[PDB]
Amino acid sequence: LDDTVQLVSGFEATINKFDKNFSAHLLDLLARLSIYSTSDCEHGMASVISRLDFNGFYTERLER
Amino acid sequence: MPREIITLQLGQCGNQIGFEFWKQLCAEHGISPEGIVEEFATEGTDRKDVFFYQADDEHYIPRAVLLDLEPRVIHSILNSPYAKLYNPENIYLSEHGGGAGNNWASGFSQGEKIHEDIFDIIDREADGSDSLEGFVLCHSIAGGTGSGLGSYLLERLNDRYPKKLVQTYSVFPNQDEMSDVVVQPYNSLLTLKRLTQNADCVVVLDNTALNRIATDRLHIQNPSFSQINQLVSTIMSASTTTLRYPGYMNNDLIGLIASLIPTPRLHFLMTGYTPLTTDQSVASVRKTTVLDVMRRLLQPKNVMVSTGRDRQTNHCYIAILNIIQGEVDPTQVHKSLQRIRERKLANFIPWGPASIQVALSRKSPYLPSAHRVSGLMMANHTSISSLFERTCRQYDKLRKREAFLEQFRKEDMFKDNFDEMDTSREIVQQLIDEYHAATRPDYISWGT
Amino acid sequence: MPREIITLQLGQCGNQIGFEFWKQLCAEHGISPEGIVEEFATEGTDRKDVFFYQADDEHYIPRAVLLDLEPRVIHSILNSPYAKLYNPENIYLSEHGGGAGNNWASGFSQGEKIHEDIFDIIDREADGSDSLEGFVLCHSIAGGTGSGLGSYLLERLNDRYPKKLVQTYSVFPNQDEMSDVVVQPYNSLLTLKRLTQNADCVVVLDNTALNRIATDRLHIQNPSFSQINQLVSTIMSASTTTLRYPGYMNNDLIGLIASLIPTPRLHFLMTGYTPLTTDQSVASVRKTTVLDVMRRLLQPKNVMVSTGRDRQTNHCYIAILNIIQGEVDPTQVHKSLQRIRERKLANFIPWGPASIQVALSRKSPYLPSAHRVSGLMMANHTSISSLFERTCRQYDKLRKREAFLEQFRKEDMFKDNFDEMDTSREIVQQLIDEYHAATRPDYISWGTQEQE
Amino acid sequence: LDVLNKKYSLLDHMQAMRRYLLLGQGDFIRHLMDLLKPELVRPATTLYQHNLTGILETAV
Numbered sequence A: 001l002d003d004t005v006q007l008v009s010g011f012e013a014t015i016n017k018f019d020k021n022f023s024a025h026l027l028d029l030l031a032r033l034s035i036y037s038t039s040d041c042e043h044g045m046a047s048v049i050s051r052l053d054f055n056g057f058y059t060e061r062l063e064r
Numbered sequence B: 001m002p003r004e005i006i007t008l009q010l011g012q013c014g015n016q017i018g019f020e021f022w023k024q025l026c027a028e029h030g031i032s033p034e035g036i037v038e039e040f041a042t043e044g045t046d047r048k049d050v051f052f053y054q055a056d057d058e059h060y061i062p063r064a065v066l067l068d069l070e071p072r073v074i075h076s077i078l079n080s081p082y083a084k085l086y087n088p089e090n091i092y093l094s095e096h097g098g099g100a101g102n103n104w105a106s107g108f109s110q111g112e113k114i115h116e117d118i119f120d121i122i123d124r125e126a127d128g129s130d131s132l133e134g135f136v137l138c139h140s141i142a143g144g145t146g147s148g149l150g151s152y153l154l155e156r157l158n159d160r161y162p163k164k165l166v167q168t169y170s171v172f173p174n175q176d177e178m179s180d181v182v183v184q185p186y187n188s189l190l191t192l193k194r195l196t197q198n199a200d201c202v203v204v205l206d207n208t209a210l211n212r213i214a215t216d217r218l219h220i221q222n223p224s225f226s227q228i229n230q231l232v233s234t235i236m237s238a239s240t241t242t243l244r245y246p247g248y249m250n251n252d253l254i255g256l257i258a259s260l261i262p263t264p265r266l267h268f269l270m271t272g273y274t275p276l277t278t279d280q281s282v283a284s285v286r287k288t289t290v291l292d293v294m295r296r297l298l299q300p301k302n303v304m305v306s307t308g309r310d311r312q313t314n315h316c317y318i319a320i321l322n323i324i325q326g327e328v329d330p331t332q333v334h335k336s337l338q339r340i341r342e343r344k345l346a347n348f349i350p351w352g353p354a355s356i357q358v359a360l361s362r363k364s365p366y367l368p369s370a371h372r373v374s375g376l377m378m379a380n381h382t383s384i385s386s387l388f389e390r391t392c393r394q395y396d397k398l399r400k401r402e403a404f405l406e407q408f409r410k411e412d413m414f415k416d417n418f419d420e421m422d423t424s425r426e427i428v429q430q431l432i433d434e435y436h437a438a439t440r441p442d443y444i445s446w447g448t
Numbered sequence C: 001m002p003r004e005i006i007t008l009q010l011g012q013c014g015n016q017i018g019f020e021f022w023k024q025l026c027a028e029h030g031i032s033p034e035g036i037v038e039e040f041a042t043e044g045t046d047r048k049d050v051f052f053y054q055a056d057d058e059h060y061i062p063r064a065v066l067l068d069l070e071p072r073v074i075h076s077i078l079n080s081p082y083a084k085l086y087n088p089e090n091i092y093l094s095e096h097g098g099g100a101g102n103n104w105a106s107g108f109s110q111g112e113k114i115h116e117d118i119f120d121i122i123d124r125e126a127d128g129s130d131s132l133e134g135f136v137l138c139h140s141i142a143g144g145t146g147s148g149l150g151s152y153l154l155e156r157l158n159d160r161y162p163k164k165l166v167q168t169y170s171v172f173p174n175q176d177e178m179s180d181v182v183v184q185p186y187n188s189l190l191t192l193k194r195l196t197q198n199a200d201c202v203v204v205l206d207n208t209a210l211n212r213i214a215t216d217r218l219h220i221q222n223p224s225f226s227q228i229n230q231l232v233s234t235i236m237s238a239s240t241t242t243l244r245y246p247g248y249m250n251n252d253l254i255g256l257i258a259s260l261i262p263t264p265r266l267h268f269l270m271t272g273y274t275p276l277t278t279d280q281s282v283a284s285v286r287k288t289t290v291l292d293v294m295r296r297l298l299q300p301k302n303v304m305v306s307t308g309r310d311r312q313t314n315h316c317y318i319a320i321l322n323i324i325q326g327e328v329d330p331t332q333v334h335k336s337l338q339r340i341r342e343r344k345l346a347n348f349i350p351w352g353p354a355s356i357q358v359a360l361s362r363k364s365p366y367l368p369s370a371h372r373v374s375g376l377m378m379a380n381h382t383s384i385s386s387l388f389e390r391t392c393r394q395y396d397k398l399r400k401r402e403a404f405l406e407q408f409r410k411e412d413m414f415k416d417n418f419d420e421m422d423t424s425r426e427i428v429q430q431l432i433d434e435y436h437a438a439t440r441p442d443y444i445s446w447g448t449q450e451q452e
Numbered sequence D: 001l002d003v004l005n006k007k008y009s010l011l012d013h014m015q016a017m018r019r020y021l022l023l024g025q026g027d028f029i030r031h032l033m034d035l036l037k038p039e040l041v042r043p044a045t046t047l048y049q050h051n052l053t054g055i056l057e058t059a060v
Helices: A004-040 A043-052 A059-063 B011-029 B071-078 B104-113 B115-127 B145-160 B184-197 B207-216 B225-244 B253-258 B290-297 B330-342 B384-401 B405-409 B419-437 B441-445 C011-029 C071-078 C104-113 C115-127 C145-160 C184-198 C207-216 C225-244 C253-258 C279-283 C290-297 C330-342 C384-401 C405-409 C419-437 C441-445 D002-008 D010-021 D026-040 D049-059
Strands: B005-010 B052-054 B060-062 B064-067 B134-140 B165-172 B201-206 B268-274 B317-326 B356-361 B373-381 C005-010 C052-054 C060-062 C064-068 C091-093 C134-140 C165-172 C201-206 C268-274 C317-326 C356-361 C373-381
Touching: A004 A043, A004 A059, A004 D049, A043 B330, A043 D049, B005 B011, B005 B115, B005 B145, B011 B060, B011 B064, B011 B071, B011 B134, B011 B145, B011 B165, B011 B225, B064 B115, B064 B145, B104 B115, B104 B145, B104 B184, B115 B145, B134 B145, B145 B165, B145 B184, B165 B184, B165 B253, B184 B384, B184 B419, B201 B207, B201 B384, B207 B225, B225 B268, B225 B317, B225 B356, B225 B373, B268 B290, B268 B384, B290 B317, B290 B330, B290 B373, B330 B356, B330 D049, B373 B384, B384 B419, B419 B441, C005 C011, C005 C115, C005 C145, C011 C060, C011 C064, C011 C071, C011 C134, C011 C145, C011 C165, C011 C225, C064 C071, C064 C115, C064 C145, C071 C091, C091 C115, C104 C115, C104 C145, C104 C184, C104 C405, C115 C145, C134 C145, C145 C165, C145 C184, C165 C184, C165 C253, C184 C384, C184 C405, C184 C419, C201 C207, C201 C268, C201 C384, C207 C225, C225 C268, C225 C317, C225 C356, C225 C373, C268 C290, C268 C384, C290 C317, C290 C330, C290 C373, C330 C356, C384 C419, C419 C441, D002 D010, D026 D049
Parallel strands: B005 B064, B005 B134, B134 B165, B165 B201, B201 B268, B317 B356, C005 C064, C005 C134, C064 C091, C134 C165, C165 C201, C317 C356
Antiparallel strands: B052 B060, B268 B373, B317 B373, C052 C060, C268 C373, C317 C373
């Protein structure tokens, strides 16, 4: 369809904030998955985890 | 309904690639040269409607458009048994038959002259598609027709079909060989300009890499155009296998390309093929494991891209998609990924999470495969910039020498200036740097 | 993962030894002349990755680098049946083919000139190694290529791979034969200097001892380089068996040698082999006992190191490691050690607790062994300094006569002076003094600059 | 005895105990320790059981 530039920048900022929240919830999900994989010895979830942080993006969050 | 794909084959090289692709698809699907399904072609498991149309309940016609500005090649194609595979209503031929003279500017001018015919052909083919995703152009970037006419077609498709996907099969000029086409850097620049402004996806096909692979991997001392075309047809077949071997995943082009293009700007794709074998080595069906398959695929000798050894840039993979075809054990895939991670066989982007996607695919049932397992690699690797950087360096070498520019100034597209070539060179340099930047965490702010 | 070892074969003698070593390793591992594991070689229990690389899922390629400054030997290697066993990217041949002319200085200059190309080849071979530990150089110290090119390569490897171990198998000139190469003692001195400064371990191979053994034991009047190379290949096979027959202990070279080299200066290793048998006596697998093994090992005829008779230094054994191959009973080993101690069959260092270590090893399953029991002796004996002192004396004998020195003065390494020979003499003197000190309790201060 | 051998591999289980639990696979133990050094040097409170199991599988 496109103050309009300000609206676009605000939308981008809101998207980035939602993305931050999503990433935090995803890291919490990965932690819960790790807990479940350690309880149930589910190698599948460990393979999923190794897939998820191939570039190590999630590795620092897991350490945190 | 399937998302039909119209295949546009442009210039001598592009038209040869398209013809060999249609031949290979017919052979894999058991389709006769006339477009009729052979009685042996009972495996209705392929999705032809993505790339082929049914002319009747029995006859499948390729959704292929053969486009040339010179009549010689089109007439030679029309003398093959496969003349009936393509819909003639989707074929636009330039009336002048003179070609582009290996001049991109001439190709663009010819496209402008055949614009009406080309868009009429495109619309006629579009109405035959139930859920047309977009158009796929197969062309060379070094010639005139496939480069110039291809760029014109891309521009007009972008203007007219802004809601359709645009994939290209773009044959890039050899960057390691001194091109006899002194205007190849001009042609390459115009093609890169259009890819930056008007293409959504550029599949780079480096003739230098094709020759290198034929020599080192196919053991072909002097690779013929025909052998390169057959290798390209094998690659295209592998790229279309997910359409030809339907499965649980990656059943659509957007699903295939999403993993390769993380951002709209990062739309430059590199290709990989597996298993790479010399024609003589067909004899031994090696029980290659997914780990073994990936390891051979990870070998540059098996890589379908000849990147120079850049000593200055720590090139890395931005993204990897492995399409594996044939009998695949999931546990072997898991072990392969495990071994790849343990061995750090792939470097991923530092600015975001990146990994090697692995797809397992069936082979075509109508074509007996000598190999139990085959594989395609799609990868975003910063060393592919070295091919692009090498092309840019050759462009700069010609532009700094103003070599053969008087012939382009003879053509209206280049008559007044070569500013499009210089902007293309700058954009390609920025692309090389971004591909190098994409190996670094600061790639998040790269290009800002 | 295995600690891969790159084998460097230098000059005519070194390259022949490397070729025969690769043949022996292939035979022990059941690798075909093309590098492919034979179908009968179903025991996947060997660790090829320590010494071999896989060329394919079936083809094992030796982690061996054949290096010469003269193309004749490399071409002769490429004409053998084993040409397809090795990875061709690990083969470096000097383009000029002229060799070093039996001049260490010329070999060093050639190594310096081919440093970039050689290190590119080395890196190409290294990528085929999953966990490359380091390089092993097989060479002669008397020639030009194996001595000079070997010294240059050792220097560049030490500079480039400062964290990797560098062991050398250095073939020393025959000391009982008058060398026609009057500058051979100078070349040997320069090579020993470089081994002192840039090598971590030098295995001394005296051509005089090889010829003597061939004459008295093999009945070979004129031992060829090939016969010496086949004996060396047998020795190398025995030394690599613990890599080829994995077990609980001694799975790596560094673990084996750590007990032997207390200080960087005490880097002169002695070798021993058992059982020593003539080729004709293969028929009877003699049930040699650990006591019998130890008794035969103490015979100088069975020691694979020719240490000079030092009359000035009360040379003694600091420590002994016996690598025994074949069927060994642990209780027999214990009783043998007890008997050796009671019989004082081994002298230990006077400055610390020391004993005779005993290793029991399996034979290669792919190679039929004619002997029920085989053994390697590793010993630290101060008389090995006398071999180095003898080399120094030969160097001094040539330098004092300036014999054949003009050929070395043609090469930059020896053009201005013979300082490498004098440094070799000083290093051998320090080695002699430390070896004498190592027989004494004051060895605790041996190698301290105040003691030097 | 036949049942124990065929169904529970009792003698084979003992051989496995020798190779692994008795550290008979010395090369494996060496490589495992080399990989573990950066992990085993860390405080045991910092060890993740899932991470240790994944490292074990990778070393194997």
